[PDB]
Enzyme design. Sequence first.
Site, short mmCIF file in Angstrom:
data_model
loop_
_atom_site.label_atom_id
_atom_site.label_comp_id
_atom_site.label_asym_id
_atom_site.label_seq_id
_atom_site.Cartn_x
_atom_site.Cartn_y
_atom_site.Cartn_z
N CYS A 1 30.24 41.20 50.98
CA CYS A 1 31.57 41.24 50.39
C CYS A 1 31.45 41.00 48.90
CB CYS A 1 32.45 40.16 50.98
SG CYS A 1 32.67 40.27 52.75
N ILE A 2 31.49 42.09 48.16
CA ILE A 2 31.37 42.04 46.72
C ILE A 2 32.58 42.75 46.17
CG2 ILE A 2 30.08 42.81 44.73
CD1 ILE A 2 28.71 40.74 46.59
#
Length: 153
Positions: free
Chosen positions: A94-95
């Site tokens: 999750c970026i």
Amino acid sequence: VPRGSMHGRAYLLLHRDFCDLKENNYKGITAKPVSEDMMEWEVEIEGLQNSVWQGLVFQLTIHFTSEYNYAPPVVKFITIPFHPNVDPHTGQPCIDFLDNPEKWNTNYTLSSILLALQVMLSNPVLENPVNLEAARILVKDESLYRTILRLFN
């Protein structure tokens, strides 16, 4: 290969980016095109310094698309890791600049993405983690957390 291929936008950008990456010779970062497309990559990023992942290595694959530079590549962990921000089901990290369209920037080159990944993946966003157990264990006793990582290696 289709005539005019070696002339695609994405291909030329990645071509330039790769030459830059090679010139940069960044310590702790390896990336290799695993296709003629230059769309599929195999990467290894060493754990940041003075971080829980010190001594560890993130092994990922990065899939770019013909839309590249207008769109972020898709990054996935080859082997789902025990990590607070990596989707335990998708192996995907999750970026923001990868998942939030408003966060992408055409200034992000192969090098940027690699350095940014290194820092971010070595500094979880405990805020609202996708992997609860990982975050929880990390919070209390980061030493145990590490022990678990080693066990996963």
